[PDB]
Design goal:
part of a larger assembly, 2 chains, A: elongated, B: three-stranded antiparallel beta sheet, 3 strands, binds magnesium ion, binds zinc ion, RNA-binding, ribosome, bacterial ribosome, proline-rich antimicrobial peptide
Chain lengths: 53, 64
RNA sequence: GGGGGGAACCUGGGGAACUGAAACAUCUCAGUACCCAGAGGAGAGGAAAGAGAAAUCGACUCCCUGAGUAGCGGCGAGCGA
RNA sequence: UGGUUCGUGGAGCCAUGGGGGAAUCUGGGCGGACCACCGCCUAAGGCUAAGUACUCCGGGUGACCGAUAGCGCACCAGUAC
RNA sequence: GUAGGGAAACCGAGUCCGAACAGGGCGCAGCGGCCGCAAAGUCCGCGGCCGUGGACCCGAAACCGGGC
RNA sequence: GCUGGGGCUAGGAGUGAAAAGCUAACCGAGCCCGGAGAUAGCUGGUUCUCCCCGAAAUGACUUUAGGGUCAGCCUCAGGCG
RNA sequence: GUGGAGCCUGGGAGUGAGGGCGCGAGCGAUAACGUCCGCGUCCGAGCGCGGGAACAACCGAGACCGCCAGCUAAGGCCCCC
RNA sequence: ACCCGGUGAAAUUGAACUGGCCGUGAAGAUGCGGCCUACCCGUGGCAGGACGAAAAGACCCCGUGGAGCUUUACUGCAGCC
RNA sequence: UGAAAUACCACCCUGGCGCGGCUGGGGGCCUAACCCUCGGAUGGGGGGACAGCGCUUGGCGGGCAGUUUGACUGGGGCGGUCGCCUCCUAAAAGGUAACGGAGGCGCCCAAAGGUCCCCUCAGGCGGGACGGAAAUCCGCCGGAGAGCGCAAGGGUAGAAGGGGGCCUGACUGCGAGGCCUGCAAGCCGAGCAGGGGCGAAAGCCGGGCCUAGUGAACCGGUGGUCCCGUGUGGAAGGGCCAU
C-alpha cells in the first residue's frame, strides 16, 4: 500500500453492506472495482463495488 | 487491607468453570485489509492462556 | 461580654513534597504533613426542595454488611462510592 | 471551578467566583445530557439531646519491660551539657 | 458453595459463533453393607509463599512545610 | 580610609567594586524541627544443632544489560508405573 | 535397562558476572592467563585427599565415623623421602 | 633531639612465635616450595618494604541516583499584551 | 393582448429615500461613577467613562517551576548499529555468538489471481534485403546453463516458465490434526455447509513457485448490527461485526 496503491472496501450492491476489504492500484485501475462476491447477508453472489475505505 | 481486583484484567479475561483463563485473540484491531479471511476469522475466537500466564492473571482476580 | 491556655480528639479557612506510576507531566502520595481561625467536654451533622424504582423508605450521627461491588482510571499505577 | 466513584465524559446532582436574571403552588427543585409521561420533594432563616472521637487526669488489668529494657527521665530530667 | 455459556438481550446441562439438526470454543456425568463409610464445599487452627503497609536491619545525596 | 555604639535587609531570599563570594568555623541554595522509618533495581550485615537432596551463571523479551518476567536446571508433597 | 530413573498435578526456590582445559570454528597476528560460539569435562560448590617442588580447574580419585591392619591408582623406589 | 626526677597523650591495631634469594601463587609473598642465612632482649638513628596510616577515589564508568546552570527541549506559571 | 392586462382597494416583494424605535461600529463634546490634586473638603481644580479593578478570550513569556534528554559497545564518547528476509560461519537432524564475511525488505500484480486448453528455453554453428555481437525468419545441434516482477537460496520444462478462452475461490460459516514455540505471536491445513468459477470429466480454486514487503494493547474515526439504554417510551452514549 502506498499513495497510489490504495485500500478499499467492496459493497453488496443489493444490500449495501461492505463485505470485503482489499486493495488496488489507482493509476493502473482508475475505474471503480466491480466484482462478483458472496454476500453473507443476501446469502448469494452479488456484484460488489469499490467504495471508499 | 483486602486485596483489590485488577480492573484491567477483569476487563480482558474470564475464568472458566474449571479455572482456565480465556481471552480474545490479538491482532485484528486494525491493519486488517490484507489479512486473509482465515486470519480474521480465527482471530475472532477466544483462546486459553498458557498456564504460567493464566495462573498469574488468576491471582489478580481474587473475588471472581 | 471578649482577649489567654489546654495532651489528643473536632469543625472551618488555607495546603506541600519525597514517594508510587520501576523514567515522567495528567494521575498518586492527599485534602495527608503542616500553618491559621474556632469550638468544646466533645465537635461536626441533623428533622428532606432526601433517597431512587420499591406501587418503597422516612432527621442526623456511629458500628457491621452491602463491596474491593458499581464505577473512576496516561482504562496505566492505582482510586473507590 | 470545586465536591461526588465520576480525571470532559452521554455529566446529571450539591456548591459558587463572573454575567444575565424570575415566579408564590396554575409556584418551584429532583429521579445522570435532552424531551414526554409517571412519580419524589418543598431551596434561598435558625436551633436541637443521645448513640461517635480523644486521654493531660484517676482507677483497674496484663502468656507487657525489668535499669543497654520500659517513657528521653525508676535517681532532683526536659536537668547537666 | 449448590450451573454454565454469552459483550449483551438471553437461553440453560447446556450455551456461544453460525443459515445449519455442520463443526468447533467454554461447560454438564464415590465405597461398602435403606444403614454406616468416604466426599463437593465451608468454618476454625497451624505452616509455606504472595499482595498492601516502612514489610529483613542499617546507610544517602536530595525534595517539601513551618519556624530560628 | 579605618573603627565603637544603635538599627534595617534571609533562604530561590538577602547582600555582593562579582569570587556562584558571604548570610554564626564545610553555602551552586543556611539551620532547626516536621512529612520521615522519603527513596536506594546499590554496598554492608543477617545470630542454635543434626540429617536427606542439591543447582545456575543459558534462551526469549525487557529505557534492558551487575535489575527483572517466562522457560531451563534444584527441592518437597500427591499421583502414575 | 528398577535408577536419588522417567512421566503427571501442585508448594518452595536459587540462577540468569562464570572460569580453566581438550576437541571443532570465527574474530585476533596459524598473539594474549585475549575474545566469541559449539560438544565434552572439571573448578565453581570437591581451596577435602594422592601425584605434579610449591599451584581452583593437568594426572589419580568422588572424603558418613573409628583402627599403631591389608591391596592398589597416578607418580615413584640413590640421600633429603 | 639525648640522659636523670615529675606528669603523661595519639592515630593505628584480626591475631602474630613477623629474615634473604630464586620460584610459585588472584599476575609485586615474613606466612607456600626449594635453598641460604640466623643465639635471647633492647637503645639512638634511616626511611626501602609491610601493595605502611588517613579519607567507603574527587579521575573513569555504572544507577531509567541528586543537584546548580542553559536554550529556538517539553510542559506550565508569574509578568506583560 | 401576452405566461399573466388595465380603472379602484388591499396583503406583500426589488431597490431606494426621509422621519422614528432599537441597536453595532467610528468622531466630537459633557460630568456625575472611578483616578489625581487643592492651607479650605456636601466644595474647587485636572483626567474621565478612559484608566484602575472583577470574570472570561487568545497571545508573548528560561523571569521562574517540574522534568525529559534510549540501549548495544573489547572502558566511555565519537562513529556504527537496533525490526524483517537470504547465504555463509554452523562442527552432514533442529538450534547456535562476536562492532564476524556478503546482500536484500518496509513493495508489488485487477493480472502478475482461479480454471481449461495449447506451447517450450538459453546458447552454439549454417543460411537470409535494409540489419549491425545482438531486432525478425529458416535449418541442425542443444535437459536446462534461460524463465520465474525485486536479494539470495531452495525449487521447477512430466512447469512453477510462455499464449489464449471463460472468469473473481484475492470466498462466507467453520475446521480434524500438526509445524514452530518461554509467552504472545507466526505457519501449514484435509474435511463438512452455503453460494459460486473453470472443466466433457477426473477434479482444481479460501490469492500470488516459496521463504522479506511488517506493528500488540490503549484512545479514537467510518459502515453495519439492533445487543445495553440509569422510574417508563425514546434519545444521548456505549457493546458487537467490519474496517
Ligand atoms: Mg483497564
Ligand atoms: Mg484484535
Ligand atoms: Mg491498536
Ligand atoms: Mg475493531
Ligand atoms: Mg474500531
Ligand atoms: Mg497476502
Ligand atoms: Mg482469504
Ligand atoms: Mg479479505
Ligand atoms: Mg465474521
Ligand atoms: Mg463477592
Ligand atoms: Mg465461580
Ligand atoms: Mg480567640
Ligand atoms: Mg478559648
Ligand atoms: Mg479543610
Ligand atoms: Mg475564615
Ligand atoms: Mg482547602
Ligand atoms: Mg505552596
Ligand atoms: Mg509529584
Ligand atoms: Mg514514601
Ligand atoms: Mg507500588
Ligand atoms: Mg517514580
Ligand atoms: Mg521507580
Ligand atoms: Mg530522574
Ligand atoms: Mg511524580
Ligand atoms: Mg506511598
Ligand atoms: Mg487527592
Ligand atoms: Mg485542614
Ligand atoms: Mg497529625
Ligand atoms: Mg482557642
Ligand atoms: Mg459524651
Ligand atoms: Mg453535641
Ligand atoms: Mg452543636
Ligand atoms: Mg423544616
Ligand atoms: Mg456480594
Ligand atoms: Mg482520593
Ligand atoms: Mg457551573
Ligand atoms: Mg474533580
Ligand atoms: Mg468516559
Ligand atoms: Mg459530573
Ligand atoms: Mg454564581
Ligand atoms: Mg408543580
Ligand atoms: Mg412551574
Ligand atoms: Mg436545584
Ligand atoms: Mg438543575
Ligand atoms: Mg432532570
Ligand atoms: Mg429524585
Ligand atoms: Mg425526592
Ligand atoms: Mg448547627
Ligand atoms: Mg436525651
Ligand atoms: Mg454525639
Ligand atoms: Mg474513653
Ligand atoms: Mg492511667
Ligand atoms: Mg518481674
Ligand atoms: Mg542502669
Ligand atoms: Mg533508660
Ligand atoms: Mg544489672
Ligand atoms: Mg515518668
Ligand atoms: Mg535513655
Ligand atoms: Mg537514665
Ligand atoms: Mg540532673
Ligand atoms: Mg457445543
Ligand atoms: Mg466425615
Ligand atoms: Mg474439610
Ligand atoms: Mg506464592
Ligand atoms: Mg508503612
Ligand atoms: Mg518492616
Ligand atoms: Mg514481607
Ligand atoms: Mg533511611
Ligand atoms: Mg544540602
Ligand atoms: Mg528538584
Ligand atoms: Mg525547588
Ligand atoms: Mg524551608
Ligand atoms: Mg519560609
Ligand atoms: Mg561610622
Ligand atoms: Mg559602625
Ligand atoms: Mg548592634
Ligand atoms: Mg553597625
Ligand atoms: Mg538592604
Ligand atoms: Mg535579612
Ligand atoms: Mg527569618
Ligand atoms: Mg533554600
Ligand atoms: Mg536572589
Ligand atoms: Mg565589597
Ligand atoms: Mg549555627
Ligand atoms: Mg554558616
Ligand atoms: Mg561561613
Ligand atoms: Mg565559607
Ligand atoms: Mg539545592
Ligand atoms: Mg530548593
Ligand atoms: Mg516543628
Ligand atoms: Mg511519607
Ligand atoms: Mg521507611
Ligand atoms: Mg528517586
Ligand atoms: Mg542510589
Ligand atoms: Mg536476620
Ligand atoms: Mg549428593
Ligand atoms: Mg544468559
Ligand atoms: Mg517477550
Ligand atoms: Mg527492545
Ligand atoms: Mg521500550
Ligand atoms: Mg540495575
Ligand atoms: Mg523462574
Ligand atoms: Mg528433571
Ligand atoms: Mg516444581
Ligand atoms: Mg513422590
Ligand atoms: Mg520409585
Ligand atoms: Mg539425583
Ligand atoms: Mg535430579
Ligand atoms: Mg519455603
Ligand atoms: Mg529469580
Ligand atoms: Mg539471579
Ligand atoms: Mg542479566
Ligand atoms: Mg550473561
Ligand atoms: Mg563475566
Ligand atoms: Mg558452563
Ligand atoms: Mg560462556
Ligand atoms: Mg591455572
Ligand atoms: Mg571451550
Ligand atoms: Mg591431545
Ligand atoms: Mg579450539
Ligand atoms: Mg564459526
Ligand atoms: Mg609470530
Ligand atoms: Mg578466557
Ligand atoms: Mg587460548
Ligand atoms: Mg583461541
Ligand atoms: Mg566449559
Ligand atoms: Mg559463585
Ligand atoms: Mg577435582
Ligand atoms: Mg562435580
Ligand atoms: Mg575444601
Ligand atoms: Mg594437588
Ligand atoms: Mg602435590
Ligand atoms: Mg611433593
Ligand atoms: Mg583439587
Ligand atoms: Mg561418598
Ligand atoms: Mg603392595
Ligand atoms: Mg605405575
Ligand atoms: Mg623425586
Ligand atoms: Mg643514664
Ligand atoms: Mg622522663
Ligand atoms: Mg603467636
Ligand atoms: Mg623471629
Ligand atoms: Mg607465574
Ligand atoms: Mg602477596
Ligand atoms: Mg614473588
Ligand atoms: Mg620467611
Ligand atoms: Mg606455616
Ligand atoms: Mg618462605
Ligand atoms: Mg622453607
Ligand atoms: Mg641468603
Ligand atoms: Mg629502633
Ligand atoms: Mg620504611
Ligand atoms: Mg623521620
Ligand atoms: Mg611484608
Ligand atoms: Mg612503604
Ligand atoms: Mg595506603
Ligand atoms: Mg588501611
Ligand atoms: Mg557510605
Ligand atoms: Mg567507593
Ligand atoms: Mg567512586
Ligand atoms: Mg566528574
Ligand atoms: Mg572507567
Ligand atoms: Mg551519571
Ligand atoms: Mg532513561
Ligand atoms: Mg537501568
Ligand atoms: Mg535522573
Ligand atoms: Mg534536577
Ligand atoms: Mg516590563
Ligand atoms: Mg474633554
Ligand atoms: Mg471637566
Ligand atoms: Mg471631577
Ligand atoms: Mg480635558
Ligand atoms: Mg475599561
Ligand atoms: Mg477596587
Ligand atoms: Mg469571554
Ligand atoms: Mg490565559
Ligand atoms: Mg529550568
Ligand atoms: Mg519556553
Ligand atoms: Mg533557578
Ligand atoms: Mg518529582
Ligand atoms: Mg524520555
Ligand atoms: Mg528516554
Ligand atoms: Mg550505555
Ligand atoms: Mg571502544
Ligand atoms: Mg558492558
Ligand atoms: Mg566486546
Ligand atoms: Mg579493552
Ligand atoms: Mg573489556
Ligand atoms: Mg552516538
Ligand atoms: Mg519490523
Ligand atoms: Mg545451520
Ligand atoms: Mg548448516
Ligand atoms: Mg544444521
Ligand atoms: Mg552437527
Ligand atoms: Mg525443534
Ligand atoms: Mg555494530
Ligand atoms: Mg541495509
Ligand atoms: Mg492473461
Ligand atoms: Mg502465475
Ligand atoms: Mg488465464
Ligand atoms: Mg536460437
Ligand atoms: Mg546468423
Ligand atoms: Mg546483410
Ligand atoms: Mg542476425
Ligand atoms: Mg535459472
Ligand atoms: Mg533487485
Ligand atoms: Mg458465465
Ligand atoms: Mg491446531
Ligand atoms: Mg503456540
Ligand atoms: Mg462447484
Ligand atoms: Mg462447493
Ligand atoms: Mg458446466
Ligand atoms: Mg480448501
Ligand atoms: Mg507471481
Ligand atoms: Mg510474494
Ligand atoms: Mg502477517
Ligand atoms: Mg495506555
Ligand atoms: Mg502504553
Ligand atoms: Mg473503542
Ligand atoms: Mg430511560
Ligand atoms: Mg432496547
Ligand atoms: Mg432519567
Ligand atoms: Mg412517545
Ligand atoms: Mg424499549
Ligand atoms: Mg427515532
Ligand atoms: Mg446508537
Ligand atoms: Mg452503534
Ligand atoms: Mg470486532
Ligand atoms: Zn449482501
Amino acid at each position: 500500500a502506498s499513495e497510489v496503491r490504495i485500500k478499499l472496501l467492496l459493497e453488496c450492491t443489493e444490500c449495501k453492506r461492505r463485505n470485503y476489504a482489499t486493495e488496488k492500484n489507482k493509476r493502473n485501475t482508475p475505474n471503480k472495482l466491480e466484482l462478483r462476491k458472496y454476500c453473507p447477508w443476501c446469502r448469494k453472489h452479488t456484484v460488489h463495488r469499490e467504495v471508499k475505505i | 487491607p483486602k486485596m483489590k481486583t485488577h480492573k484491567g484484567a477483569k476487563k480482558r479475561v474470564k475464568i472458566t468453570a474449571s479455572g482456565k483463563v480465556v481471552a480474545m485473540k490479538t491482532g485484528k484491531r486494525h491493519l486488517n485489509w490484507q489479512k486473509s479471511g482465515k486470519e480474521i476469522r480465527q482471530k475472532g475466537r477466544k483462546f486459553v492462556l498458557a498456564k504460567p500466564e493464566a495462573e498469574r492473571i488468576k491471582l489478580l482476580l481474587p473475588y471472581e
